[PDB]
Amino acid sequence: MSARRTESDIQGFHATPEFGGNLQKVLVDLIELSLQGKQAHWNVVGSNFRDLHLQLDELVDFAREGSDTIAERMRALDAVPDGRSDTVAATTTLPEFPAFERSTADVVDLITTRINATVDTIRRVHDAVDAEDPSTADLLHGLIDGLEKQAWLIRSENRKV
Amino acid sequence: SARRTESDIQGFHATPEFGGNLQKVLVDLIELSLQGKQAHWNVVGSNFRDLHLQLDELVDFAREGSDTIAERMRALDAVPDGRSDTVAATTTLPEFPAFERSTADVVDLITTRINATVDTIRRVHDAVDAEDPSTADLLHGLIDGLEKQAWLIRSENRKV
Amino acid sequence: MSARRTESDIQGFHATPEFGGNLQKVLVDLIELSLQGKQAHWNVVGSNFRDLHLQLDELVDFAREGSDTIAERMRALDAVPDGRSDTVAATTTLPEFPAFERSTADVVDLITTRINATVDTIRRVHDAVDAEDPSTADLLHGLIDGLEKQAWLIRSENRKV
Amino acid sequence: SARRTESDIQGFHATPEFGGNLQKVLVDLIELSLQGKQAHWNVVGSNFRDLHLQLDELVDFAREGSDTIAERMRALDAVPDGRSDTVAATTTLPEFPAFERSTADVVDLITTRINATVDTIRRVHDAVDAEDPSTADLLHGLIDGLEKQAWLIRSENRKV
Amino acid sequence: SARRTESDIQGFHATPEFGGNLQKVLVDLIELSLQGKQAHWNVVGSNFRDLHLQLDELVDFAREGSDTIAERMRALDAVPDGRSDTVAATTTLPEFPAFERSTADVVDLITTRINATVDTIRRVHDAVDAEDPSTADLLHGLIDGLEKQAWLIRSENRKV
Amino acid sequence: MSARRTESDIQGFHATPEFGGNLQKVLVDLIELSLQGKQAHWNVVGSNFRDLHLQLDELVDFAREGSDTIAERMRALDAVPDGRSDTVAATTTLPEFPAFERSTADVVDLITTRINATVDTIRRVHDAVDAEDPSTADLLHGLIDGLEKQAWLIRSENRKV
Amino acid sequence: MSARRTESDIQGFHATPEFGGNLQKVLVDLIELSLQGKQAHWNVVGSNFRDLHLQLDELVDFAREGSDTIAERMRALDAVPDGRSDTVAATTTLPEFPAFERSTADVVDLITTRINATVDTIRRVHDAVDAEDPSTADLLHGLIDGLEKQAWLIRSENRKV
Amino acid sequence: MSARRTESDIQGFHATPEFGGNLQKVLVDLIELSLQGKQAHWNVVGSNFRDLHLQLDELVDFAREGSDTIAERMRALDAVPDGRSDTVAATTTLPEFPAFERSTADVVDLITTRINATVDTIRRVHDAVDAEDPSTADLLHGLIDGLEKQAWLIRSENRKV
Amino acid sequence: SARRTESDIQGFHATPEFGGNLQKVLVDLIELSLQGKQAHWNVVGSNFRDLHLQLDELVDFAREGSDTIAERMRALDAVPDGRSDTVAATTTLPEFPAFERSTADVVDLITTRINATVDTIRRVHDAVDAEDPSTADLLHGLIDGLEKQAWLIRSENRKV
Amino acid sequence: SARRTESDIQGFHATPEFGGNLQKVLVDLIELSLQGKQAHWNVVGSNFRDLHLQLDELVDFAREGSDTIAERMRALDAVPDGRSDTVAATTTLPEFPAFERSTADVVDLITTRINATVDTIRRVHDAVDAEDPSTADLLHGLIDGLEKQAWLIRSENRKV
Amino acid sequence: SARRTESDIQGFHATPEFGGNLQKVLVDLIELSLQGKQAHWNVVGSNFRDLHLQLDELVDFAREGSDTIAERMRALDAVPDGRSDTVAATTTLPEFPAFERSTADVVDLITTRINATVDTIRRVHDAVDAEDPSTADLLHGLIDGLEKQAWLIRSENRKV
Amino acid sequence: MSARRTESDIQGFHATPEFGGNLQKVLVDLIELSLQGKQAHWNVVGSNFRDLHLQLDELVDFAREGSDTIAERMRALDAVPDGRSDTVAATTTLPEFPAFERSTADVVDLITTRINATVDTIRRVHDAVDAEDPSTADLLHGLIDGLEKQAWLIRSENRKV
Numbered sequence A, C, F, G, H, L: 001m002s003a004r005r006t007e008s009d010i011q012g013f014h015a016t017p018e019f020g021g022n023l024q025k026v027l028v029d030l031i032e033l034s035l036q037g038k039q040a041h042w043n044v045v046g047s048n049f050r051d052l053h054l055q056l057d058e059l060v061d062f063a064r065e066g067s068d069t070i071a072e073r074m075r076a077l078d079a080v081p082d083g084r085s086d087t088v089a090a091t092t093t094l095p096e097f098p099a100f101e102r103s104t105a106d107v108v109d110l111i112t113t114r115i116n117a118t119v120d121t122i123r124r125v126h127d128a129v130d131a132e133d134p135s136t137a138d139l140l141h142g143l144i145d146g147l148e149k150q151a152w153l154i155r156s157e158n159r160k161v
Numbered sequence B, D, E, I, J, K: 001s002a003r004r005t006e007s008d009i010q011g012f013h014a015t016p017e018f019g020g021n022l023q024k025v026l027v028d029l030i031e032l033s034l035q036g037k038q039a040h041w042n043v044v045g046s047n048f049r050d051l052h053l054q055l056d057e058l059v060d061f062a063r064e065g066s067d068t069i070a071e072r073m074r075a076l077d078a079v080p081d082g083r084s085d086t087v088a089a090t091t092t093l094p095e096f097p098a099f100e101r102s103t104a105d106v107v108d109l110i111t112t113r114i115n116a117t118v119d120t121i122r123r124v125h126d127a128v129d130a131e132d133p134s135t136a137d138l139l140h141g142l143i144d145g146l147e148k149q150a151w152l153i154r155s156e157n158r159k160v
């Protein structure tokens, strides 16, 4: 038992209220993006429908895994996520997705904007998150990388060169 | 030759009432999935792991359910609305509470909200079936799957 | 603004005693079919042994999945299944499978008859089940379809010209 | 004690009218698969690849469907006929044109062919359902899957 | 040159006593599977899900086991009897009770049923081993797997 | 320094009308074989039903993969396949499959004959195809090999002693 | 404090020459069975061809896995296997498989006899093997079990009523 | 060869003795945690046994992959791990796991404490590791994230709310 | 005994001309794969996703192709050279341009470069076949696969 | 009815001697796995990769082995102790050295330590078999697997 | 209308000379597999594991090959003979030596055995190709795969 | 819409020309390494050929995935990769791989050097990349970690202790 600690209770790392708040911000925008992505997935029509229909689902898959990652990271650090519809609608920074069928060209522009809004939130909280807990900042890097890839894969459709 | 002569054969299109009925089912499935994840993350206490896991299975089912309904709407020329504001403003499910909740409370809460979701589907069933029996089969799969989830979750709290 | 319900306790659909009894009838015949299917699977000998040996196992798989589906549907609807050996033996409508080895030709006829009997139970309770709960009748349709396919695949061995 | 004592119990036999109704579904599903492959090979132009791929998924679904219907016929002791001459002579689908066809034309052509196939299933539905509800459920699966394919394909040409 | 020259070489035949010993194992394995499913459906209460799941794993093991024993009988030209009437009439397992049962009760009941099944295998072991060591190895696999299941289930009720 | 070609447009290999017609002949017989294979698969009854039922589906799988290979090879070489039902019926060299149920023994003989006919078409066009395009003849070799294996696996049911 | 052994060289279990010879006897019969199994698999014709064709390949798979197990067990215990064609032919106890095509019925009887012979070798050496090394006898039990199952699945074709 | 280096030997990044020491600290606590996790996995009894039994194995899987990651990172950086039992026992910071059967409630508290001790070690060395080699700090972030998730999944069992 | 008596049986070795012919194929396959990735990354515009995806499939095929040829060279005692300087200095493919390129331009560019690669293989085919028919079969697989890729890519730009 | 009447049928429980014998096997398997990983990480020199890989396969086998034994102890009401202090203080294996070691030295070292582990199992075998033949079968699997590992590792150092 | 009207159309029959040519390939492929396993078991020394593993891949390939050839014979109504006595009596491969052999010796021995097997295939190639080009393609696959194995194995002994 | 942004176009993060240049440097060395790895894979001969042959392919797999990661990260950040053969040859920092067959000992030393050169490039640009975009630095950490592991796995072959 030469280097063994003799403490009965050893407590875990606990997130500050600011840290908890910062992850909550990322969480709602990821959930909103997932909901908007599905709306777009269902209602997109027109030229190159199928590619967009499929890509939007991949976006949703990524944003859903992201939300679970962030929420469970909060839980791990003794913070409490709120992913409820009312909270998401009232607190998301994403511009509202429009109703009804939308052209593929419209959907490309709309969804690129909403991905970029989500990335902006993560980028905005990054430094404060990193200063408190570098391990969580690494989860943010995964999200930034994955989402910016989605934006490129989606926006390239509308690029005229 | 029995070949038809038309160059533009149109498909079955749903009435506004039918589309509205599927929209009702859609928002409650989306709401259930969001509440399911909330519960999944925030449940604590005796038998946490089983409940944490079962709730993810519920969410998986409700998400594929929502996709099925929304895409059935699209197939029949209806237009789904699964946006957060719409879901919040039009869902019939009792609001799930914020914060950590005990496994026993989560069992009771989620069972109620699953039953609320099944109730929506059962309420619209006959009107859906009358117009399009094929869509009612999709509703049957939902009723079956969700009622199975209700049983698997609620049994935790049963007395004898 | 809000369409949210306000009850703290919302109850699930509860099957009538009659409905429960009807599903119980299906259950015992499916279990009996599974047990007879294995008996036949072990004890068949003669011309085209292997095919029947293999097909019988597929029948047993389907009947076992079937019994679990029915029993769990009962549980979902607050009914209580009884799949115990004594109950199955005492209440199954299937003719007893004979003892010892049986020829491929005999097993074909015997098992086809027992599938037909199992399906007849499902068809007999169908309308009463459908009237109370259309979602359960759909599970019955899957059973009817899957079992009648098994009957075709098995019986065709003995069909001539 | 509840055991039935007859040595041979007969199964459910389809009437010949039922058999003929499923035969109508079968030939159109087969025709659709053959037309689907024709389109899959010969489609050219803007968004070729998506169409090429989606057409194969349609064919996969129609082939599984024709197997399902033919085997259901056999299960009920009806006898299917999926031979080329019969399919050509009795299909209700408009003929697919020869040669390379643009993606836009293929979209419209195949949507029409799918809609014709669904129409056949919808036309026989009630007579099939009246004799055998379990078979009608298979028809529901086909209606659901084909109408989904129609939506996935036609959306390419939709202007909003 | 070392080749045997007889046209038919006979295989190893089990004595009827050996066959009867394996028959004893078979009925108890089948009874256990049927009781296992009964418990799996009807268990309710604290830690429902773990028990529900573990009971299915037990049933899987007992079903594979009964197949192994019945097929070993056939390999040695014995003839198994796994029919409902025979199983009910000849199983050594205490009857499983009807109705919903609490998780605590199910734990104790099933542990007893597993232990009865293992006892049968242990009881016939030496007579089986004396005639055919290869069959005794299958019995060892069953003893090992069932006693593992007994430990996994009973641990739920263990107070320390 | 550099071996780079400087043309901005380099054309692909274009099949002659004769070559296209030869592959078209293969195509229709493969599709016809697939259709007859399914007919036999559904409608075979009698001794050893299951084996033939199963083997026929493997034949259909191979013939379907075959037809796609040939049709796509045509497309690659700027030829245009015709796999429509009317064309297949009007131009196939296979004897018509008879209607209604057929015995296992009859199905064995019938299907073996139709595979033999399909292979004969491929063998008949082989040398002309090989002369123009050796790479396409290799695809023909795969078809010949795979189909003659199917013929062996099917026909051996009826071969005595 | 410490129960650690202090030898720098600890030797493994070394089989006696007799033990090695006993496993060699098993080995040659397993290889011979594999070779005869393939011969039968290629050359069987007649009623229920496909089932026997398929089952024979499963037998060959088991016998091949068996020969590798035995040969490697020999190697583990510092014995040296001989699986060369000349040795197998010169020392196998199996009756020779006859040449050319054989009927399904004949193949059933022939192969059953050869499995019985293979198992008899294993049963003959069993007690001597078990006495020296119980762990090796367990591998023998797996072989006996798996081969006698093959014999049942094959022979049952010819068993009447 | 315009930007090509012309050096025969190009050496890799080598860890300082301090860095090597820091990774060694993480290594022994990960190994100790794996050994304690297995002890808990085997000996846990009581209410919710199965969930805990299963979760503890997932913990062990993660801690074992972690130890291999750390040890091989050491090797990559020309450092030498010591994962031997004596070294692990003499140098681990984890409180000793108690002997005998332990209740699920006890195991939850015990294992949460030991996970937290392991995380503390990683958190303690993090800044020094990051200052020398950011790529290795990222491996530490994976470990922190994964272990703190395990702690949350385990400790939630004992939480009374 | 028909057993051969030699202790050192040597294998087939390729002529310098043969090795040089396979080297020609090798550099064009490597170049195609590098250009394929360049296009995959830098393509933009209408139907980006389909082209992005198809180009990766082309690259996959060309990379396995290059490995096949280089390893066939090794089997026959030839020595491949797939180094960047060698590929750049000896490839027959027109250089792929830098920077972003439209999907329409990428279709035309990549089709030309696939055709250039096929041309190399077709040019060396007869000399390869004359020496070693087994290697010509590998060439046939390449011609078939690449010409399929050309068709799948170029069809995007087709008019009617 | 042959049904047993007992409500509480107990399972087979091991003697203290038996539990102690399995404990002996357990600590040597755990020690072998720790030494296996040490060797896996620290081996260098000629044929490094093969040895690195084989040692992981050894570790995999020893870890599943330790779990099998410890869980067999639990099934029979024995209590394993796999803690680091216990393993270090009670293992019979010669200590594996620290630091980098050549492949040739690693081969010799690991072979010795595998043989030490097999020796433990062989030493306790008869006493285990006498009490519980089913557990001896688990020991046979261990002896077989580890002796296979010894052969695969040691053959590297063999002379002719 | 283009339908042939004969009731039985005969398939392609191999001449007996063709059959005998494939028989030559078959026995050498079988001999190679048996020698491959002999080597796989008995190889010892430096780089044991790589050789042990590579020899099994060779055996896998040769076994698939012998099946391919024997089944091609059957497809064309030739009748294979793969019996031990026939293989020993008619194989052209030099006998594999008894006992343990060093990795260096095994490398050289097996390379020779592979080269002998390839020589047989190359020797019959033109006669096989003249009668049936499709069979020659199978021979090409064998030549390609075996010569790859020869390169992978012999490279171990190559000094540069 | 309480926190919702009301902007039509929200732009993504764009890499500076320096950042783009820095990723381009990493890209060419990863591509060069993949090409050299394959050259080595094909042409390596001598003692322990197979292990090296196999390890070199794993290296190539990793370097190819790396190049795609870097290139697509550039695309995501509105930078434009150049992976063309001429560019790679003219701008790589890796010493040229020699022609012809090379001994396993030679290949080990050669490839270790070239991996180390590639790692050096990534390490050289790391701080500038991290300062501008921490999410991209994390991708570099993956590359450093993965490549240094390959170097250790390859170089250990030549280590004499």
Ligand SMILES: [Cl-]
Residues within 6 Å of the ligand: B053, E053, H054
């Ligand atoms: Cl679980």
Ligand SMILES: [Cl-]
Residues within 6 Å of the ligand: C054, F054, G054
């Ligand atoms: Cl089968």
Ligand SMILES: [Cl-]
Residues within 6 Å of the ligand: A054, D053, I053
């Ligand atoms: Cl796609």
Ligand SMILES: [Cl-]
Residues within 6 Å of the ligand: J053, K053, L054
């Ligand atoms: Cl390897």
Ligand SMILES: [Fe+2]
Residues within 6 Å of the ligand: A134, H134, L134
């Ligand atoms: Fe960082």
Ligand SMILES: [Fe+2]
Residues within 6 Å of the ligand: B133, C134, D133
């Ligand atoms: Fe209905």
Ligand SMILES: [Fe+2]
Residues within 6 Å of the ligand: B137, C137, C138, C141, D137
């Ligand atoms: Fe229905």
Ligand SMILES: [Fe+2]
Residues within 6 Å of the ligand: B137, C138, D137
């Ligand atoms: Fe349904």
Ligand SMILES: [Fe+2]
Residues within 6 Å of the ligand: F137, F138, F141, I137, K137
């Ligand atoms: Fe060829």
Ligand SMILES: [Fe+2]
Residues within 6 Å of the ligand: F138, I137, K137
């Ligand atoms: Fe080929």
Ligand SMILES: [Fe+2]
Residues within 6 Å of the ligand: E137, G137, G138, G141, J137
């Ligand atoms: Fe044993």
Ligand SMILES: [Fe+2]
Residues within 6 Å of the ligand: E137, G138, J137
């Ligand atoms: Fe065993």
Ligand SMILES: [Fe+2]
Residues within 6 Å of the ligand: A138, H138, L138
């Ligand atoms: Fe990371």
Ligand SMILES: [Fe+2]
Residues within 6 Å of the ligand: F134, I133, K133
């Ligand atoms: Fe050729």
Ligand SMILES: [Fe+2]
Residues within 6 Å of the ligand: E133, G134, J133
């Ligand atoms: Fe024993």
Ligand SMILES: [Fe+3]
Residues within 6 Å of the ligand: A068, A072, B040, B056
């Ligand atoms: Fe989760």
